[PDB]
Design a protein around this ligand. Structure first.
Ligand SMILES: Nc1nc2c(ncn2[C@@H]2O[C@H](COP(=O)(O)OP(=O)(O)O)[C@@H](O)[C@H]2O)c(=O)[nH]1
Ligand SMILES: Nc1nc2c(ncn2[C@@H]2O[C@H](COP(=O)(O)OP(=O)(O)O)[C@@H](O)[C@H]2O)c(=O)[nH]1
Ligand SMILES: [Mg+2]
Ligand SMILES: [Mg+2]
Lengths: 366, 361
């Protein structure tokens, strides 16, 4: 069955842990470095298998969304009807946009505590306005009015709202693109000359398929060039290399001195090089073995993108003067040379190979 | 001259604006949160008065809870024609809760009420209301007047404005000056200055700290005590000055922002208190929806935020934007506090409410 990665987000005390348990309980009855703190559960509807991540606190949601083990195919925003939207409601929607969470469904929780239908519609309208503020489609967003606690306790009218939520997961969250179905991309690691064959470049194929005879672009670091794949070897047992495989790709004519580590091989026109991008960055705390002191607009660390690192300079948002350990911030980075990147690409910030930060490319500038 | 802060309270249309004008006129010839105020100053022979009046009920609620000046006394205006009305009662109760220490009554519109029995009946109702809220109803000065006929220059009614001013002068004591109260310093910055030791900085709120004096360190953690070994201004530090206080012994990790330095014994730490709270309206940039008993915002006391949980009054289920309510607050750790301490209610460092400590539990 199709595998979908989801997770709960929202303000502390709004009911993310309770909802996580209610979903597991009801679906079983009905259909039966950086420190990463997570709760992991799996559950099934008739057509799909879900892997669900919840986190204990705000800082953990920030780290999961920016560098967690699984990319969320969709998020369940939990909003308590009693408080309405709160600061981490807003912060988690914003972070969802910045890190590329593609869909959000809302579970309006604690509706057992709110008798007033006008009050429920008022909270729903505030949530849709907030979703639309951050470029989610607030008017089309599924909003389920429920009680995680009364569903976990076995009340039929509230268990029905959990079923309604799972029906929205199935209908509203599409399966992501499989890596094998995306445009070919190989992050280049080693570069060899083989006598009377030519230049071989190695790496693990990230996306797609490369076949003997296909044109490839060499993208990043230096101006983009093009060549032809004249052979493909797979490391561990017509010729081709597939997403997830370690391969050696033989190139026509390209010399050792015309291709390097940290460039990519890609389907021509599928990916572009950039120096300048907006990002969301988590700065490691002192307890995670990161920086002890804040940094300012001058800071010049190394950015680690796939198989290489590149120096760059940062700009901070309007009215922000410094960035403290453990903070997350929007920063505009200018790398000393271009790197192949799309929105959603993860990177590390390092100081002599101590990790000090984790980022996601939010928006490419020019 | 001694400076005294006063103001008018009472029900819409009972004559607070008219009385404000009448006092000014007769004394001259004789001698975020949206803050809406009318400010006038007037003098008696011995005292200078700064007087605040407000246009609407919601403005009087905001002035009492978060106004720039603590009232030393309030003039309650009651129309003899209506008697006490809902905002009469609400302002007296709020006055008790925010610690307004004296109320004088101006029974207004007596130009419209020819019947002495009826005037005595309104006076008895006002005295009973004041006593219901622990003001001294039986001994409260009550002046029978007409703000309008005084403002229009009728001598019989101008004389009652003079009677009201003589009551301001005799009934309202001057407040304690901050310089004469026990030393209190809200702690902001904490430095280690090797060769001297730990300096704590802030603006002296009350009193004087002198080199060699013992201070208590109050709030957040269990109370500790040490000695002042130095005072720098940015021998002593006085109320209103920015200072750095050097401490005997204390390490940078044994003192923190949000604690206070105090005269020992003068202030105690508490988690639990009753408060009067004004919740900002949507138009003031506050909350859009009501909150219920589970709400857990931050409470800003002097120099620091502290998370807390709330209990509402019996039979209150929710609090709307723009409402003012009595709430019981339980903070996650103690804060040095007395009755009358103001605080902010914040969401993500953004202000959603203003309150005052009414009773320590
Ligand atoms: N009344 C009510 N309480 C709820 C509901 N869901 C959760 N709670 C309570 O709210 C509190 C916080 O829930 P929890 O799931 O731990 O919140 P989290 O911080 O978002 O994970 C717990 O006491 C829950 O029992 C609900 O639907 N109705
Ligand atoms: N007859 C009479 N009318 C008065 C007196 N004092 C005020 N008024 C009138 O009552 C109305 C309300 O007065 P105002 O001072 O604006 O009331 P506020 O809402 O309490 O500020 C106005 O029409 C005044 O002229 C008074 O002593 N006698
Ligand atoms: Mg939880
Ligand atoms: Mg008025």
């Amino acid at each position: 069955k199709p595998h979908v990665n989801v997770g709960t987000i929202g303000h502390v005390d709004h009911g993310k842990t309770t909802l996580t348990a209610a979903i597991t309980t009801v679906l079983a009855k009905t259909y039966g470095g950086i420190t990463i703190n997570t709760s992991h559960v799996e559950y099934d509807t008739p057509t799909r298998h879900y892997a669900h991540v919840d986190c204990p606190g705000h800082a953990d949601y920030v780290k999961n969304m920016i560098t967690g083990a699984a990319q969320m195919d969709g998020a369940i925003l939990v909003v308590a009807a009693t408080d309405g939207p709160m600061p981490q409601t807003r912060e988690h929607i914003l972070l969802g946009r910045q890190v590329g969470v593609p869909y959000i469904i809302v579970f309006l929780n604690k509706c057992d505590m709110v008798d007033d239908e006008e009050l429920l519609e008022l909270v729903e309208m505030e949530v849709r306005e907030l979703l639309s503020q951050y470029d989610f489609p607030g008017d089309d967003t599924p909003i389920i009015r429920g009680s995680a606690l009364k569903a976990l306790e076995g009340e039929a009218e509230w268990e029905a709202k959990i079923i309604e939520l799972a029906e929205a997961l199935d209908s509203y969250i599409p399966e992501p693109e499989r890596a094998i179905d995306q445009p070919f991309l190989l992050p280049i690691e080693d570069v060899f000359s083989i006598s009377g064959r030519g230049t071989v470049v190695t790496g693990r194929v990230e996306r797609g398929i490369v076949k003997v005879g296909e044109e490839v672009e060499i993208v990043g670091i230096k101006d983009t060039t093009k060549t032809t794949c004249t052979g493909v070897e797979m490391f561990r047992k017509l010729d081709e290399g597939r997403a997830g495989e370690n391969v050696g790709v033989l190139l026509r004519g390209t010399k050792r001195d015309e291709i390097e580590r940290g460039q990519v091989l890609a389907k021509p026109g599928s990916i572009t090089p950039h120096t300048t991008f907006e990002s969301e960055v988590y700065v490691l705390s002192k307890d995670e073995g990161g920086r002890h002191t804040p940094f300012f607009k001058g800071y010049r660390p190394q950015f680690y993108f796939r198989t290489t690192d590149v120096t760059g300079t940062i700009e901070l948002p309007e009215g922000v003067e410094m960035v403290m350990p453990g903070d997350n911030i929007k920063m505009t980075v200018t790398l000393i040379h271009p790197i192949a990147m799309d929105e959603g690409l993860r990177f590390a910030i390092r100081e002599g190979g101590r990790t000090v930060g984790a980022g996601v490319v939010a928006k490419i500038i020019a």
